[PDB]
Enzyme design. Structure first.
Site, short mmCIF file in Angstrom:
data_model
loop_
_atom_site.label_atom_id
_atom_site.label_comp_id
_atom_site.label_asym_id
_atom_site.label_seq_id
_atom_site.Cartn_x
_atom_site.Cartn_y
_atom_site.Cartn_z
N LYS A 1 29.82 -45.36 -4.44
CA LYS A 1 30.22 -44.30 -4.93
C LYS A 1 30.61 -44.55 -6.60
CE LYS A 1 30.98 -40.77 -1.42
NZ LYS A 1 29.94 -41.40 -0.40
N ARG B 1 53.89 -27.08 -12.37
CA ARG B 1 54.97 -28.11 -12.07
C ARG B 1 56.16 -27.69 -12.58
NH1 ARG B 1 53.09 -32.22 -9.20
NH2 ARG B 1 54.89 -33.65 -9.69
N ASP C 1 62.16 -26.83 -0.25
CA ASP C 1 62.20 -27.36 1.11
C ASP C 1 63.81 -27.86 1.33
OD1 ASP C 1 59.41 -26.86 1.87
OD2 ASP C 1 58.99 -28.56 0.70
N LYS D 1 35.79 -52.87 -4.45
CA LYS D 1 35.67 -53.47 -3.03
C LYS D 1 36.71 -54.37 -2.83
CE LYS D 1 32.31 -54.18 0.28
NZ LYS D 1 30.57 -54.00 0.65
C1 LIG Z 1 30.59 -41.06 0.90
C2 LIG Z 1 29.31 -41.42 2.05
C3 LIG Z 1 29.64 -41.06 3.37
O1 LIG Z 1 30.86 -42.01 3.65
P1 LIG Z 1 31.64 -41.34 5.14
O2 LIG Z 1 31.37 -42.17 6.74
O3 LIG Z 1 32.09 -39.73 4.90
C4 LIG Z 1 28.37 -41.41 4.39
O4 LIG Z 1 27.71 -42.69 4.02
C5 LIG Z 1 27.25 -40.39 4.09
O5 LIG Z 1 27.25 -39.04 4.76
P2 LIG Z 1 27.29 -37.62 4.27
O6 LIG Z 1 28.54 -36.90 3.92
O7 LIG Z 1 26.34 -36.94 5.26
O8 LIG Z 1 26.44 -37.64 3.07
MG LIG Z 2 58.46 -29.95 -0.81
#
Ligand SMILES: *CC[C@H](OP(*)(=O)O)[C@H](O)COP(=O)(O)O
Ligand SMILES: [Mg+2]
Ligand SMILES: [Mg+2]
Ligand SMILES: [Mg+2]
Length: 326
Positions: free
Chosen positions: A63, A140, A247, A51
């Site tokens: 997570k 690749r 490209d 964090k």
């Molecule tokens: C990873 C958890 C999510 O963060 P984000 O604003 O995509 C949310 O806290 C949970 O939302 P969910 O996608 O409805 O589980």
């Molecule tokens: Mg390319």
DNA sequence: GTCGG
DNA sequence: GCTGATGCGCC
DNA sequence: CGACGGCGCATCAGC
């Protein structure tokens, strides 16, 4: 593979938000977090530790705590078991099927590789070529083949007009040992920000690369950008090389440094650098760096005589191409 | 989802 | 035809 | 709580 578990988790979450949710800012948020964690020179031991990095907030910290406790994420476990999600994630791997086309196809019962090959008449020109080379495009390119591809392009461009300069950009210019595809920046003195003094400047090059059977298919083509397919020639009785994405971007010759900065990337580096430019009151595109006026209206293009001049304007120390990767 | 007014 | 919006592509 | 990078080509709706 340091913090490989965590960065793989964040990439999978990014692809979900992009492909299924169609939530481009969540996608960009996950990829920024993945890139900053990939660069971190320690084994992350906690969400709290992660964090402290810019781009990692409360939700990614939680997570990471889940992932370090259990070695998985229940959110990802559920996405993987969801049929619409897994169908959309598969279809979006075909060049030319984006998030909207994938959901459309799933709505018509077209969910698998067999389903696509049955339904070719439902596919536009891009999608049909994406289907034809599905397996090839996931491969690749080893740096060794990229050097042989460089030799053909540079040598064939010299044959059209010795005044063309062709530069291989993308991961190749960042010195990667393998590349997803071949990105070629093209300049000619007849095309500047002031004047197009000759037409078909890109066309003539594509035509020569078609003539020697290097370019095999076209996905899209205008005056300044070509998107297509190429293939190295193979020897007597050797298996053919896979088909590859190429490209080609024609950039005004006086705007080479902005162009080579853009085309060297990485994409995440470009987004980070352009976002920083905005913080410093400048806007960067592939052509120019311009100041933001009082309003937020971009002013006149600033002088640029090197890649480093662009870094100087936004007060970043120069990053060599090799240091712009994830 | 994260960051900075 | 042209213009403007959107999808999908590039880094 | 607004902003998040910036633009090329293909395609389609509306005039
Ligand atoms: C990873 C958890 C999510 O963060 P984000 O604003 O995509 C949310 O806290 C949970 O939302 P969910 O996608 O409805 O589980
Ligand atoms: Mg390319
Ligand atoms: Mg590339
Ligand atoms: Mg790429």
């Amino acid at each position: 593979t340091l913090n490989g578990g965590i960065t793989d988790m964040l990439t999978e979450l990014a692809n979900f938000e992009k492909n299924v949710s169609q939530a481009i800012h969540k996608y960009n948020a996950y990829r920024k977090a993945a890139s900053v964690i990939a660069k971190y020179p320690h084994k992350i031991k906690s969400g709290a530790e992660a964090k402290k990095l810019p781009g990692v907030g409360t939700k990614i910290a939680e997570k990471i705590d889940e992932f370090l406790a259990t070695g998985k994420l229940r959110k990802l476990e559920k996405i993987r078991q969801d049929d619409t999600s897994s169908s959309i994630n598969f279809l979006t791997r075909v060049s030319g099927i984006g998030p909207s086309a994938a959901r459309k196809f799933v709505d018509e019962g077209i969910k698998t590789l067999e389903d696509l090959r049955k339904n070719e008449d439902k596919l536009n020109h891009h999608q049909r070529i994406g289907l034809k080379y599905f397996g090839d495009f996931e491969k690749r390119i080893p740096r060794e083949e990229m050097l042989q591809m460089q030799d053909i392009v540079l040598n064939e461009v010299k044959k059209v007009d010795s005044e063309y300069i062709a530069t291989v950009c993308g991961s190749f210019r960042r010195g990667a040992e393998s590349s997803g595809d071949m990105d070629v920046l093209l300049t000619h003195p007849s095309f500047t920000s002031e004047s197009t003094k000759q037409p078909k400047l890109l066309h003539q090059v594509v035509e020569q690369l078609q003539k020697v059977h290097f370019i095999t298919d076209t996905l899209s083509k205008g005056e300044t950008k070509f998107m297509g397919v190429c293939q190295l020639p193979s020897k007597n009785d050797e298996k053919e090389y896979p088909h590859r994405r190429i490209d080609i971007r024609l950039i005004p010759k006086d705007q080479y440094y902005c162009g080579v900065l853009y085309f060297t990337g990485s994409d995440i580096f470009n987004k980070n650098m352009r976002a920083h430019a905005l913080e410093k009151g400048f806007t960067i595109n592939e052509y120019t760096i311009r100041p933001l006026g009082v309003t937020g209206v971009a002013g006149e293009p600033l002088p640029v005589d090197s890649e480093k001049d662009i870094f100087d304007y936004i007060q970043w120390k120069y990053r060599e191409p090799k240091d712009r990767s994830e």
